[PDB]
Design brief:
The chain is mainly alpha-helical. It has one domain. It contains one helix and no strands. It has one helix at 6-33. The longest helix has 28 residues, at 6-33. The radius of gyration is 15 Å and the shape is rod-shaped.
């Protein structure tokens, strides 16, 4: 349904977001290092 789904939708943005934030820090470092 369309209610009861906001924590689960929010967890999927958050779960996407931790990898994305960490990757932008490591792959900026590798570009910079090179």
């Amino acid at each position: 349904k369309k209610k009861g789904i906001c924590f689960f939708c929010s967890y999927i943005i958050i779960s996407f977001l931790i990898v994305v934030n960490m990757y932008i820090a490591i792959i900026l470092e590798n570009f910079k290092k090179k």
